[PDB]
Design a protein around this ligand. Structure first.
Ligand SMILES: [Zn+2]
Ligand SMILES: [Zn+2]
Lengths: 153, 310, 310, 153, 310, 310
């Protein structure tokens, strides 16, 4: 014991937890999926190294366990990452970012019409991949776009 | 009971082949033996948030030929003075409680679908939600092709006009691609050609198709000639003009068409089809119209009658 | 025969209690056992000198559910291009000779009453003459309260919104004041509070009433919550805004409401009632709507049928 | 003090950080105050009971000296909170959030007709105290609203 | 250089007590010794995003009289009739690149102010922005007062009409507040009383004001009577009639009227000021009206010229 | 007398290489030593058959600054709102009988030209005629370029946006063609590429041009970037969104940007040019905008005065 370097953190308490998130992409997942509409430990931190070429973000909640699929509906944003639900004091569930059939309430049929705008409804699309990008079909307007165009205003 | 009872009619895309054949089957049967009291005691909202009289009348006539009563509106440009004083959803919710069915047309895409999630068990039939669907048109197109060609399989179809912004088309071509055989011909200018996604979808089901510059090429080999109106505003006076009276169809051009061949148009026309055609025997664009009465009439029966068998 | 045969329906004011209970009675009965042919062979003018589609459809649907035929118009702002080329009286006189009944709506107060003196024995039903009456609304309000509360006597009613210019309200509160028990609560801003003459009339029949600043006070003790849309134009952007999203009703606010309690709105809304309410079990503003079909349907039966008994 | 204590609530590396911020009224601050909008390191702790217990949100910034101005503008939400300028667990200073004079870019004129809306400018108001309210005058629209009237949205 | 050379003119507030004085002296000085070339070779942009003839002619006239060239537009133009067109930001950016001054009227509070942060060193003068500021009215009013009373202090001012929405009143009672010994008597229907915010400022300054129901009450000692109109739409058509009591002046109510007394009104006037008044020597709404050619005239001078010697 | 004294100004084509030079020198000469009485006692007719504020103020402002008196009208007047009124022939005949010059904008290609054969010796200056000529834009653009680049030859010009319908682009790439060593990089959605006719002229002149999909591609060596907007209506609402890729500049895309480089745009601008750009030192769409007061100013001079010494 007694080498040379400093730290303050490590693997803490229970709850579902997150591994690997690009930069400036961290905060996103929070506001976007309403990750504070509660009272549980939602402690986190951004821009800290954990194994990558420059940056990486991680998350930490307890008492709340992700839907063994909701996981999916979360994918896309953090290309590659992990969950690893923490049921009772230690590791207990390795998951990975796989594409959902759909993704609701988070996007916007970038079609100035595509009805859902002044209307009280959840924006539902449709995931589809190929090569140069990812496509999704406006559930309401039936107009398809690439995840890029949809990801912006 | 029947496959399509109490069900919505939104996008042509989501209709099985059995689905289609059913409606058509009904159509030609309802045409054959007119049942003016089937829908006695039903009330149906003819809601036109986006005015289309031509359409309203057609639909509304089927609502009548079946003993059903109708009430609605055609909230046009002097009715649509309100952009924020009643959400569609709320309107659908309210209106959903008076009637037995809702035939609605809308300026915006997604409307019919939306209304669905706010109409309880009351059925909604999309008469054209923006630039998206309008299943009602596609079906009468079809119905018209089949009855004139005896089949909807293994056919040569021509599609002329503004292929790029013509939904009616996209819709029809998709439907057709639901049958075997069939070779397509799209003769539309370069800036209004058929869209890629359509081509690809035909690439996928391995469907025969080629492009042309003028109908004259293919004219000899087509069973169906589908004319669509181009618009000056989709280009510019010179541009348009410099090609308008180019993809027009006139009587002289049918000298090598098949007896069975028929000319079609979702209407209204203006240029695409010279008046002198209206007399040849290939002109079925009007029969095509009156047929929308048995497509739309048939649809309401199926959706509103628990079990139908002539 | 029945108390209300061949009689006019103009102002809510002139309706006996027996009168009301009758219409309501019919309503719930006509609701229970739908008689689609009672009014077979009657024609009724759906005259809308002042456009109100929402209303037209509702009324017109009852005209239909009863086997009656309808013809009329919705002379709006592009129809009302004439301020001096046909007096109402003359119109009523003329129109009075074609139909069996006249359901008219008018931009101006007094119209329904006037038409009465020029319609011979043909009945007229006011659908809203200016800022005066609109008995038709009041009745469905009622009908809705009774069926949800089992009675119209001894009840706690809340009235929220632009209490000053909301006729629908004045009308309802008067009607209610025709029953025993009943304690009122008017939570409306200071420049849109309930009018004195109403208060006094409640002072006179010795009727319980208090004012509040927000629905939260009373919320715990109300059976009926009646929401009305406020308008920005009845104040000014800042003013309104500075109180708008103040007398709004949202889901969180029903945490202490009675199971039996119901929320109402003559509609259309926009702000007054957050969307998240529409799901709670207190939301009856839509049921309130569909109920206008049995209030308006019931009325036509009574006025046009000599004797009715289910 | 061996009785009761707390595992979290640290004090590591150079960086100006806060302390004691209302519950479920801190996340709202990260966004509102274009914070994450940088590629620096920061740990966060929400639903954390401070040395004051009253459930609070809490940050932890790295090398990003904080100042009086953007500081004052932190009241309203978390009136009572603190900002001690650290240099590696070094309280080389501090202070508190005194109610600022102005307050641009983050609020919204409740005035449907306030010109601010559709145009390329920064929202600017005015601060003042009443029995229970906080008077704010839409700098453009010139109308005065209640602080709770503006924050509700 | 004077305290206003090159400064903007947006709010009546943004004006120091000492300022108003400069503007006024100036104005009178131009009424005695008019300077037709003062603003020679200067080009101003009379921009009326919010169309309003009256204020346009007054302003532009009080623009030519200084040899300044004018250019501009009324109602919505390049940006539509009330939709999409482009930011005001972008407009001011462009226009301020070719004029030596901007005079703009707009429908939303803060347009002039917003513009100011986009005109570079080109001055902008607010011709009223929605329900916010209209500096020339308040100023042209004052001057008029100053001229018929000889002073703007130790005066009895009465204000009749709609004071709750009166844009021009508020700032007028804000400005006079910047003076000593002024006594205020406000006369208006309760529905439309003087805003609280104003009273609060009146008291926190030791200023004396009292409210009334009828002009007659204070008619006795008033030096200035300021009439305003309450458009019908500011109250139920019938509400209006009822309390349209004495809130409209009539010559018969001017016997014990102080000789020096003057009747003022922004205009246009509808009912509030009877014709017969126009004869008596108190009517000044007109003379007040042509006075604003000197106030606005003075402003342009002050702002565009520095060593303003007149 | 100069080569343009008393000549008409219709097409950008009708301008010799040597001509443009005169106009420009002139323009700069008026920017240094402004001549307020150059056009004193001259009356011009600012005629806007095709309403367009922007170009009207620019033009008229660049009319007063020369002591010229103005008179005219925007939108359709004496001849309706888009119907019958009288020939343009007859209008020009009448008006040219009392003005010393005509500046007209019209909606149909050739109005200025037609007018020219009817104004007698009264000059006519085209302010854009439908999809044909708009000489002042192309000229005011050039000057701006000439001013920020020091030359109009041996330059890299980029043009982004709708180039198939861009009236102002075409003539701009026509004019620059009249110069040496210019390299062109066109960037636009295929649906709306640069017309063929233009390319053909570019090659038959040895001019170098290349096409791109993204601004970034050529961003490196461009001295001038010319932004334009593609109004939604130029493509399906959804089409637009999809490929609305980089065809709208954003400050983030200006690091390896040549210091001398300048961003230009006729305006108005909607989306294509983000606000943050306005800060950087490349944004010149505004300065370019106020430059057109000198181009148009120069023109009036050249055409109305002969021994033009400035
Ligand atoms: Zn959509
Ligand atoms: Zn403001």
């Amino acid at each position: 014991m007694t080498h040379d370097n400093k730290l303050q953190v490590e693997a803490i308490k229970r709850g579902t937890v997150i591994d690997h998130i690009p930069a400036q992409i961290g905060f996103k997942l929070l506001s976007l999926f309403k990750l504070t509409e509660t009272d549980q430990r939602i402690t986190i931190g951004l821009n800290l190294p954990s194994g990558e070429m420059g940056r990486k973000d991680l998350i930490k909640i307890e008492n709340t366990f992700l839907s063994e699929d909701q996981v999916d509906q979360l994918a896309l944003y953090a290309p590659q990452a992990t969950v690893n639900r923490i049921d009772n004091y230690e590791v207990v569930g390795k998951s990975r970012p796989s594409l959902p059939e759909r993704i609701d309430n988070v996007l916007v049929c970038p079609n100035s019409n595509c009805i859902s705008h002044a209307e009280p409804v959840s924006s539902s699309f449709a995931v589809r991949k190929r090569a140069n990008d990812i496509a999704l079909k406006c559930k309401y307007c039936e107009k398809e776009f690439s995840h890029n165009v949809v990801l912006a205003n | 009971a029947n496959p399509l009872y109490q069900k919505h009619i939104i996008s042509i895309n989501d209709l099985s082949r059995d689905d289609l054949n059913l409606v058509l089957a009904t159509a030609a049967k309802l045409k054959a033996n007119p049942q003016p009291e089937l829908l006695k005691h039903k009330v149906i909202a003819s809601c036109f948030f986006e005015a289309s009289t031509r359409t309203r009348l057609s639909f509304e006539t089927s609502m009548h030929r079946l003993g059903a009563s109708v009430v609605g509106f055609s909230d046009s440009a002097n009715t649509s003075l309100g952009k924020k004083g009643e959400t569609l959803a709320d309107t659908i919710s309210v209106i959903s409680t008076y009637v037995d069915a809702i035939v609605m047309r809308h300026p915006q895409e997604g409307a019919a679908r939306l209304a669905t999630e706010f109409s309880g068990n009351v059925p909604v039939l999309n008469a054209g939600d923006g630039s998206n669907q309008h299943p009602t048109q596609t079906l009468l197109d079809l119905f018209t092709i089949q009855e004139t060609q005896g089949r909807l399989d293994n056919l040569h179809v021509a599609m002329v006009g503004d292929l790029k912004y013509g939904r009616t088309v996209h819709s029809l071509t998709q439907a057709l691609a639901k049958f075997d055989g069939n070779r397509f011909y799209f003769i539309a200018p370069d800036a209004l050609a058929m869209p890629q996604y359509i081509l690809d979808m035909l690439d996928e089901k391995g469907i025969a198709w080629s492009l042309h510059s003028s109908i004259e090429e293919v004219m000899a080999e087509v069973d169906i000639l589908y004319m669509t109106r181009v618009q000056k505003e989709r280009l510019d006076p010179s541009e348009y003009a410099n090609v308008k009276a180019q993809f027009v169809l006139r009587a002289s051009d049918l000298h090598n068409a098949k007896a069975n061949m028929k000319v079609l148009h979702p209407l209204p026309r203006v240029d695409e089809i010279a008046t002198d055609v209206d007399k040849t025997p290939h002109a079925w664009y009007f029969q095509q119209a009156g047929n929308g009465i048995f497509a739309r009439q048939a649809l309401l029966a199926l959706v509103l009658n628990r079990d139908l068998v002539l």
